[PDB]
Design an enzyme around this catalytic site. Sequence first.
Site, PDB file in Angstrom:
ATOM      1  N   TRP A 125       0.850  -1.194   0.000  1.00 28.21           N
ATOM      2  CA  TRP A 125       0.000   0.000   0.000  1.00 28.21           C
ATOM      3  C   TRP A 125       0.888   1.247   0.000  1.00 28.21           C
ATOM      4  O   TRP A 125       0.702   2.170  -0.774  1.00 28.21           O
ATOM      5  CB  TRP A 125      -0.900   0.031   1.243  1.00 28.21           C
ATOM      6  CG  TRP A 125      -2.285  -0.511   1.134  1.00 28.21           C
ATOM      7  CD1 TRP A 125      -3.437   0.207   1.160  1.00 28.21           C
ATOM      8  CD2 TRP A 125      -2.679  -1.897   1.049  1.00 28.21           C
ATOM      9  NE1 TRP A 125      -4.522  -0.632   1.087  1.00 28.21           N
ATOM     10  CE2 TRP A 125      -4.086  -1.924   1.015  1.00 28.21           C
ATOM     11  CE3 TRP A 125      -1.977  -3.106   0.989  1.00 28.21           C
ATOM     12  CZ2 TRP A 125      -4.808  -3.120   0.922  1.00 28.21           C
ATOM     13  CZ3 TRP A 125      -2.691  -4.289   0.898  1.00 28.21           C
ATOM     14  CH2 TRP A 125      -4.092  -4.289   0.860  1.00 28.21           C
TER      15      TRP A 125
ATOM     16  N   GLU B 163      -4.472   0.007  -5.587  1.00 31.35           N
ATOM     17  CA  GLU B 163      -5.370   1.065  -6.051  1.00 31.35           C
ATOM     18  C   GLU B 163      -4.597   2.311  -6.442  1.00 31.35           C
ATOM     19  O   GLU B 163      -5.080   3.426  -6.296  1.00 31.35           O
ATOM     20  CB  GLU B 163      -6.429   1.403  -4.987  1.00 31.35           C
ATOM     21  CG  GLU B 163      -7.314   0.204  -4.604  1.00 31.35           C
ATOM     22  CD  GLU B 163      -8.406   0.536  -3.589  1.00 31.35           C
ATOM     23  OE1 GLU B 163      -8.424   1.678  -3.074  1.00 31.35           O
ATOM     24  OE2 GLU B 163      -9.247  -0.356  -3.317  1.00 31.35           O
TER      25      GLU B 163
ATOM     26  N   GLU C 201     -10.223  -7.570  -4.348  1.00 34.16           N
ATOM     27  CA  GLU C 201     -10.726  -6.894  -3.165  1.00 34.16           C
ATOM     28  C   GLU C 201     -12.194  -6.554  -3.327  1.00 34.16           C
ATOM     29  O   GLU C 201     -12.591  -5.913  -4.295  1.00 34.16           O
ATOM     30  CB  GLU C 201      -9.933  -5.616  -2.845  1.00 34.16           C
ATOM     31  CG  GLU C 201     -10.035  -5.276  -1.342  1.00 34.16           C
ATOM     32  CD  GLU C 201      -9.420  -3.944  -0.965  1.00 34.16           C
ATOM     33  OE1 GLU C 201      -8.187  -3.795  -1.099  1.00 34.16           O
ATOM     34  OE2 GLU C 201     -10.174  -3.068  -0.512  1.00 34.16           O
TER      35      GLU C 201
HETATM   36  O1  LIG Z   1     -13.141  -0.113   0.972  1.00 33.88           O
HETATM   37  C1  LIG Z   1     -12.015   0.431   1.641  1.00 33.88           C
HETATM   38  C2  LIG Z   1     -10.820  -0.490   1.508  1.00 33.88           C
HETATM   39  N1  LIG Z   1     -10.210  -0.376   0.168  1.00 33.88           N
HETATM   40  C3  LIG Z   1      -8.734  -0.490   0.319  1.00 33.88           C
HETATM   41  C4  LIG Z   1      -8.549  -0.892   1.771  1.00 33.88           C
HETATM   42  O2  LIG Z   1      -7.266  -0.509   2.269  1.00 33.88           O
HETATM   43  C5  LIG Z   1      -9.677  -0.139   2.463  1.00 33.88           C
HETATM   44  O3  LIG Z   1      -9.412   1.253   2.463  1.00 33.88           O
END
Ligand SMILES: OC[C@H]1NC[C@@H](O)[C@H]1O
Length: 640
Positions: free
Chosen positions: A111, A158, A234
């Site tokens: 992340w 993401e 996810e």
């Molecule tokens: O729905 C929120 C989730 N998406 C990425 C994960 O880290 C959370 O923030």
Amino acid sequence: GAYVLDDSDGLGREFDGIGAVSGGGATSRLLVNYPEPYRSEILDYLFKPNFGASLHILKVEIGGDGQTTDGTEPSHMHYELDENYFRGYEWWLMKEAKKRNPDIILMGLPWSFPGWLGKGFSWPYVNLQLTAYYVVRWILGAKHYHDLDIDYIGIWNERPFDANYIKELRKMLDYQGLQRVRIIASDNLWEPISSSLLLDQELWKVVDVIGAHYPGTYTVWNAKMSGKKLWSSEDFSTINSNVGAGCWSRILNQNYINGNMTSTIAWNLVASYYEELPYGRSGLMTAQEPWSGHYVVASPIWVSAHTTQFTQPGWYYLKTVGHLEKGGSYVALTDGLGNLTIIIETMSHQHSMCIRPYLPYYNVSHQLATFTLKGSLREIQELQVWYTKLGRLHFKQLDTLWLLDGSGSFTLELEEDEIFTLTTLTTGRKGSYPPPPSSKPFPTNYKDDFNVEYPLFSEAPNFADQTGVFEYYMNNEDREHRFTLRQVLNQRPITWAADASSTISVIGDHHWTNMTVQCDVYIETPRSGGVFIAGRVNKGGILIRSATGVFFWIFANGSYRVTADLGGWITYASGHADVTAKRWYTLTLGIKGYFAFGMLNGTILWKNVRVKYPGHGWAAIGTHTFEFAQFDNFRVEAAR
Ligand SMILES: OC[C@H]1NC[C@@H](O)[C@H]1O
Ligand SMILES: *[C@@H]1O[C@H](CO)[C@@H](O[C@@H]2O[C@H](CO)[C@@H](O)[C@H](O)[C@H]2NC(C)=O)[C@H](O)[C@H]1NC(C)=O
Ligand SMILES: *[C@@H]1O[C@H](CO)[C@@H](O[C@@H]2O[C@H](CO)[C@@H](O)[C@H](O)[C@H]2NC(C)=O)[C@H](O)[C@H]1NC(C)=O
Ligand SMILES: *[C@@H]1O[C@H](CO)[C@@H](O)[C@H](O)[C@H]1NC(C)=O
Ligand SMILES: [Ca+2]
């Protein structure tokens, strides 16, 4: 009316498994200090085969020291030339999962990254080889220090991918003898990864799986064309009430039916983080009270079992899956050994809403379903039956259905919000431990002197870092303060979220209104350094920059400030103080109703300072910027 289940014309896609995410961020934070036997029981409900969720897949964050939704997670390389493969709790989690299920599939994904990788910029693609080196070291360490084989490696959660990075990562893996490790991309939308694979043969060869986030059960034409495995890498991310279980139940079926996705992975694995942090209670179950031992085995656990206890990675979907005439869906799978599992869901709209996306209304009403087995399935004449009703009855086993009359056919009456699993497998079990202790608030009196010489985990319990990273620290040069807690980041990470400008770790009960917080602090940086203690901190995680409360700061230039906000924009009080660097001081902050006071070494520095009220939140400690500082003999007394 009638639904043909056949395999004579071939099978559908290979099933890859169901799993869940630990991380993004600090979602498993409060699980590690659960007492026994409860911690072990919780892990069984998640990972033990033929018991609870019986998960096929575990995905964990590769910590990069940044805030990644409900906290920060520590990296294996804080600084250049630093390597340590015993920080945080994902190593531990993976080992507990593998003990219970040796065949479990392990995935890692970043992340955030440590700042030094950016070489002056906040970008992980400045030096491709360096970032790949960082990531691959993590995979090697998992093997060398914990005997873990990582199955899948991702790119940047993401966040944009870089095609040259993905190619370098493959080259680097191979170079380190990790040909076995597969690559999934790009953990964001279907595009632009899907079109990139059609246009670039070299990229296509190095990507094994297209993983997309929150796809709404659908995929896109370019992804079908690629011929790659497609995963919902996810999904879920919804409160684990019966409606979250409904969401999870529906998409487990319809991700394959509508979107050809052969795996679905829920964020998150277990809600072991304070509920008032973003997306509170959005795990397959709940374990957010290590002090009391209380945990909740929520509905999603049993929803999972309807698939996981009766399917394994390597099974195939039948070609014959689809929607029911009057709402809901059905899938069917075989192992190629004579077994058959049929999973039926009739989740209504009102009771299966996911947060992402929200589906336009759809009708579901009572119906009859006739199923007819053909091909090799015809010789089956016995099926075990498992049933769930959401509203409530969970994973109860029903009487066997017999197909003895040679019709290879049977009929079910379906209502709304139900799940059925029909299988030839006899191994199904609703696991059960005795009930755990009742829910209790965080202790109104609480202390930690951090005096642990060989800690099991790198950080003290219940402290949830929301910017920066705090670790047990042994200093042999000091007798009174040999064992302290230390903030170890010295520069801003390559961030995922908007980390604060100041570091901060929160603890306690978010309901707390009156509190006295005391801590010994130590500022390591001359002239410019600063630390604080605080109370009524009302926001964290993704929103950590937003945090209000009461903040008592001291600085090494000989001053103090009292602010309403973490960002230090709003002053309550400020002045001079006998404070320097490299010296231990005791801070005390008392907050009651409309007023607060602060003490330095037991002596009043300020008092009767008006603060906003009503207001409530956690206690906290931290530092002015990303700077070394130590903390010792923490105490808090509070009224909820
Ligand atoms: O729905 C929120 C989730 N998406 C990425 C994960 O880290 C959370 O923030
Ligand atoms: C992906 O799944 C879709 C289903 O959403 C498949 O598309 C067709 O689905 C219809 C009914 O929805 C069937 O009658 C067709 O037979 C399906 N197509 C084919 C070629 O059989 C689609 O086949 C799947 N695609 C891939 C590449 O597996
Ligand atoms: C259904 O699955 C079970 C479990 O995979 C199969 O039973 C196994 O069969 C293999 C050989 O085919 C043996 O080596 C294992 O020891 C068996 N395990 C168990 C738990 O029985 C079974 O053959 C499959 N088919 C049917 C019709 O049950
Ligand atoms: C749903 O379907 C049933 C049966 O066809 C019908 O009676 C009912 O009015 C429908 N409801 C809506 C909101 O469409
Ligand atoms: Ca100590």
